[PDB]
């Protein structure tokens, strides 16, 4: 209870409405109702701060703010600097995923608490193959969603490793791929889509 | 010119209409206009034969029919038994992909002709990871579409290998993954989606 800090990445496609609520608020509220969650650090341009501070008084979590950075890992680092000195888990979430279920968030929190690092994923429905640099097929795969859940010590150690050795963070060379510490994949729901198109937004409403 | 036989897998989500033409006819017509294409072998339940034989007289290819099998590889084998004794390439296509562009089909035909086996693919937009049997992340990926283009000798040799050794054909352990012969991945278009949902069908119309 009150052990988890959420870093909510909200820095424009995550403020466009879905039944008249900006997409970013769906997951915001889902996290605010979970007794495990102590605080939510929203990482957004100071413009849209009010979109969230409006509800500060009704929600049952502390709210905090951080400024976005250049790339997604900068924004996480920025959020991390504002979490509570004693939180046991950091829960990083892309606000463009509105439909994450409370039950799936409980699952990945539990797994992150057990393993140290966990991510919600689903089996990749497409036929996916590795291709080499000559465009030839190189003779089980999962799609990663968010939350991505990590103990704060591990995250901080991960940022230090990258800075200390000027490592390259690609989308698929994560910070955690550099650590030897294991990352668990918690099985989520195919309904936890990311919103980036109007046809995504039709799906969103079809699902709600 | 007239060197390619198409095996069109059409064996119900590929007959539902898209601007009032059953989905299966879009690619059927795309192939029928290409001078390279000699014949199209439609693999469908004898029910819907008429959906295609109606146009037999206007299209500029020979039309042939084969009966579906248990699994997708059975239906390809069934189609293969009806191709022309002298075709140089077999072009296998899922009729649930209506929007394949003529230019992308020309590309994968050329690559299959050069390499012996080619498939239209696109870089996988999701973050995809390998996961082991303990659900831990195992520390370039492409989504395969169709056509899948293969010289007929190679396909036949591939079917013989599987039967000869009772190998297991999963969706992702293809017949071609058993061969030592290389498979080229021709870069396609993200618009070459597969139709399986109404939201897919909204995308289809949004794209046309
Ligand atoms: O990708 C992760 C997985 Br998979 C599991 C736990 C944490 C992460 C993660 N996500 C981001 Br954005 C950062 Br920076 C980090 Br570390
Ligand atoms: O997957 C393929 C690639 Br990738 C490239 C060429 C041919 C194939 C293929 N597709 C199917 Br269905 C069969 Br049976 C075969 Br062999
Ligand atoms: Cl990411
Ligand atoms: Cl397949
Ligand atoms: K709470
Ligand atoms: K979602
Ligand atoms: K959201
Ligand atoms: K979910
Ligand atoms: K445990
Ligand atoms: K999308
Ligand atoms: K033709
Ligand atoms: K298509
Ligand atoms: K079609
Ligand atoms: K295409
Ligand atoms: K060549
Ligand atoms: K789909």
Swiss-Prot record, chains A, B:
Predominant cellular place of this UniProt entry's protein: plastid
Site (Positions MEP for the nucleophilic attack): 194
Reactions performed catalytically: 2-C-methyl-D-erythritol 4-phosphate + CTP + H(+) = 4-CDP-2-C-methyl-D-erythritol + diphosphate
Entry cofactors: Mg(2+); Ni(2+); Mn(2+)
Induction note: Circadian-regulated with a peak in the late period of the light phase.
Site entry: Transition state stabilizer: 13
Organs and tissues of expression: Expressed in leaves, stems and flowers, but not in roots.
Uppermost EC category: transferase
Subcellular location: Plastid, Chloroplast stroma
Gene Ontology molecular functions: 2-C-methyl-D-erythritol 4-phosphate cytidylyltransferase activity
Alphabetic keyword roster: Acetylation, Chloroplast, Isoprene biosynthesis, Nucleotidyltransferase, Plastid, Transferase, Transit peptide
GO cellular component, one term: chloroplast stroma
Pathway: Isoprenoid biosynthesis; isopentenyl diphosphate biosynthesis via DXP pathway; isopentenyl diphosphate from 1-deoxy-D-xylulose 5-phosphate: step 2/6
E.C. number(s) listed in UniProt: 2.7.7.60
UniProt keyword Cell membrane present: no
GO BP terms, alphabetized: isopentenyl diphosphate biosynthetic process, methylerythritol 4-phosphate pathway
Observed effect of gene inactivation: Albino phenotype and seedling lethal when homozygous. The phenotype is caused by an early arrest in chloroplast differentiation.
Cofactor notes: Divalent metal cations. Mg(2+), Ni(2+) and Mn(2+) are the most effective. Co(2+) and Ca(2+) are only minimally effective.
Function: Enzyme of the plastid non-mevalonate pathway for isoprenoid biosynthesis that catalyzes the formation of 4-diphosphocytidyl-2-C-methyl-D-erythritol from CTP and 2-C-methyl-D-erythritol 4-phosphate (MEP). Is essential for chloroplast development and required for pigments and gibberellins biosynthesis.
Annotated family: Belongs to the IspD/TarI cytidylyltransferase family. IspD subfamily.
Protein name in UniProt: 2-C-methyl-D-erythritol 4-phosphate cytidylyltransferase, chloroplastic
Part of the whole protein covered: 76 to 298 of 302
């Amino acid at each position: 209870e009150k052990s988890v800090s959420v870093i909510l990445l909200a820095g424009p496609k995550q403020y466009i409405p879905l039944l008249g609520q900006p997409i970013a608020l769906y997951s915001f509220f889902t996290f605010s109702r979970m007794p495990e969650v102590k605080e939510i650090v929203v990482v957004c341009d100071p413009f849209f701060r009010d979109i969230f501070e409006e509800y500060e008084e009704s929600i049952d979590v502390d709210l905090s703010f951080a400024i976005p950075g250049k790339e997604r890992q900068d924004s996480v680092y920025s959020g991390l600097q504002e979490i509570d000195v004693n939180s046991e888990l950091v829960c990083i979430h892309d606000s463009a995923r509105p439909l994450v279920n409370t039950e799936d968030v409980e699952k990945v929190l539990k797994d992150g608490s057990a393993v140290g690092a966990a991510v919600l994923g689903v089996p990749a429905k497409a036929t996916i193959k590795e291709v080499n640099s000559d465009s030839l097929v190189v003779k089980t795969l999962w799609e990663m969603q968010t939350p991505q859940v990590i103990k704060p010590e591990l995250l901080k150690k991960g940022f230090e490793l990258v800075k200390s050795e000027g490592l390259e963070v690609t989308d698929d060379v994560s910070i955690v791929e550099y650590l030897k510490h294991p990352v668990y994949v918690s099985q989520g729901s195919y309904t936890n889509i990311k919103v980036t198109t109007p046809d995504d937004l039709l799906l969103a409403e079809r699902i709600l």
